[PDB]
């Protein structure tokens, strides 16, 4: 039956906690990346891995590397602001789980790293969920060329990342569909839970 799988994987030598519930029927996969606050731990508010699962997605979600029960990492630190060290990080930890391609979404700096893991290694990512992404403002050039369907999901109280940068990204990425979700600031995972699910997952039925 279908079971949340805790476990540690080698990534290139760095210890990752993840969590994950998978079958190896679905041929579809998701991936989720926390922000700096938070960890794989936190996704359990919004019931993410049932979720998503019943949709017919594999779901996985580590600890970066430096956080939550994850080892720190000289190849994937992220301490000296290398974003293209996560995205490095992303593609390897995709290879490591088996999976050749997969939906990413990223809430806050995990929103950066999916979205440089897009710029870098295109082939790999089935579409994005980007939650109030961080660090990317210097990107915009490159995310001009984004084809991946793409949801961008704001807080409208957020004022950690500024929502005028919301309708930006949202012109940025073309086809790209922005979501603004009433009464929650940055973490809307944790505090819109239901909302949170319910646009996710139409997005992601129609992918």
Same mark, same amino acid.
């Given at each position: 039956?279908?079971?949340?799988? =805790?476990?540690?994987?080698?990534?290139?030598?760095?210890?990752?906690?993840?969590? *994950?519930?998978?079958?190896?029927?679905?041929?579809?996969?998701?991936?989720?990346?926390?922000?700096?606050?938070?960890?794989?731990?936190?996704?359990?508010?919004?019931?993410?891995?049932?979720?998503?699962? *019943?949709?017919?997605?594999?779901?996985?979600?580590?600890?970066?590397?430096?956080?939550?029960?994850? #080892?720190?990492? =000289? &190849?994937?630190?992220?301490?000296?602001?290398?974003?293209?060290? #996560?995205?490095?990080?992303?593609?390897?930890?995709? *290879? $490591?789980?088996?999976?050749?391609?997969?939906?990413?979404?990223?809430?806050?700096?995990?929103?950066?790293?999916?979205?440089?893991?897009?710029?870098?290694?295109?082939?790999?990512?089935?579409?994005?969920? $980007?939650?109030?992404? #961080?660090?990317?403002?210097?990107?915009?050039?490159?995310? *001009?060329?984004?084809?991946?369907?793409?949801?961008?999901?704001?807080?409208?109280?957020?004022?950690?990342?500024?929502?005028?940068?919301? &309708?930006?990204? $949202?012109?940025?990425?073309?086809?790209?569909?922005?979501?603004?979700?009433?009464?929650?600031?940055?973490?809307?995972?944790?505090?819109?839970?239901?909302?949170?699910?319910?646009?996710?997952?139409?997005?992601?039925?129609?992918?």
């Amino acid at each position: 039956g279908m079971a949340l799988q =805790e476990e540690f994987i080698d990534v290139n030598g760095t210890r990752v906690f993840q969590r *994950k519930m998978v079958t190896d029927s679905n041929r579809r996969s998701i991936a989720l990346f926390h922000g700096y606050s938070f960890t794989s731990m936190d996704w359990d508010k919004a019931d993410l891995f049932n979720n998503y699962s *019943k949709i017919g997605y594999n779901v996985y979600a580590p600890d970066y590397p430096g956080f939550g029960r994850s #080892a720190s990492s =000289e &190849k994937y630190g992220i301490d000296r602001g290398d974003l293209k060290h #996560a995205a490095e990080f992303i593609r390897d930890y995709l *290879k $490591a789980n088996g999976v050749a391609r997969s939906v990413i979404m990223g809430a806050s700096m995990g929103g950066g790293m999916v979205i440089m893991t897009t710029l870098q290694y295109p082939d790999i990512v089935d579409g994005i969920i $980007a939650v109030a992404p #961080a660090w990317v403002e210097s990107l915009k050039g490159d995310m *001009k060329k984004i084809r991946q369907k793409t949801l961008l999901v704001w807080g409208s109280k957020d004022h950690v990342v500024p929502i005028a940068l919301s &309708k930006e990204y $949202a012109s940025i990425i073309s086809g790209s569909r922005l979501e603004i979700v009433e009464g929650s600031g940055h973490p809307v995972y944790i505090e819109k839970p239901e909302e949170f699910v319910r646009i996710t997952v139409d997005f992601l039925r129609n992918l």
